[PDB]
Symmetry: C4
Subunit: 103 residues, 4 copies
């Protein structure tokens, strides 16, 4: 009703529709049933991306803050940030050490 | 019967009801079917939080000890600690290096 | 048929029955339908433990080698090692730095 | 239809069939219904491997780049790389520090 299921690589992440609108002009804030990767039977959106890193991607919408995970390298996370349409420059002060280590 | 399902961000964590009572005056020790985010059909509680960090949150109840995860930054974990009503000061000696690094 | 489902904290881990026999005299090598936490309907064993760390616990049986995870502290992992009846002294050379850091 | 479910240790990872063909001559690029670990009822392939590390294994196919996870040791990951038929020498520049630390 007020929730959406984003099946990312098999893992069915779930959140309120309103949460996804918190960051406008991104792939998630743009979800629509006209999308081909939307299944009307299961009522979900399938994305062939890293399911582990997605919790971190989705946490940006939930908390309004961008943190970097520390179980994967910055480059892998940033690839995910680019696919989802998020900006890495928004990274929190606490996640600078894990952000600059790469460049 | 003696277990409860806490659907945190799509991930259905499961524990015994008694485990949640181990830390009184917290959001989890307060679960009730009167709550709106409780679904009588699936018989579960939905919370729009980081599903990965929750295992760590729930492990505090299971073991009676507060450890910090090391796959996310202290600040992100602490945000979760605040939502769940847990106190970070209870952090174990072994998790001080990951606790003070931030402040 | 030749597989068993160990529902650890909500997460249904699955392995071949033979894998669990690889380390005799442990809680997992001892699984039996006489156990109360065994559900004949779903055909699974429920354990109220850390679901994330379990993959590491189960990987000891699968690979025959004991590695320590690096997304949680040694103490938390060791608590799990004790519950499951595994011996930390078997830790691999590659996981000594994460093993001795604590003591 | 255009997707496949790889049940790795209980966790049902999902991807497009085409993604698996991106790295020829590997176990995943070779999946076939003639395989005994393929279940026609559930329509999936079961592999008794580390379910956590698999997201990293599968991310190599998705992104075309090999990164090492940092929540487990290099040796454990490499064991998985060998089972899946992937080559560790392809490791990205950003994941050298976590690759050479071991040898
Ligand atoms: Zn941070
Ligand atoms: Zn600790
Ligand atoms: Zn190791
Ligand atoms: Zn990398």
């Amino acid at each position: 009703e007020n929730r959406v299921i984003i099946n990312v690589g098999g893992i069915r992440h779930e959140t309120y529709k309103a949460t996804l609108k918190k960051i406008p002009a991104t792939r998630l804030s743009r979800l629509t049933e006209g999308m081909l990767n939307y299944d009307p039977v299961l009522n979900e959106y399938f994305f062939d991306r890293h399911p582990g890193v997605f919790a971190q991607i989705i946490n940006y919408y939930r908390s309004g803050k961008l943190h970097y995970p520390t179980d994967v390298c910055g480059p892998l996370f940033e690839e995910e940030l680019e696919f989802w349409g998020l900006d890495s420059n928004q990274v929190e002060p606490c996640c600078w050490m894990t952000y600059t280590a790469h460049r």
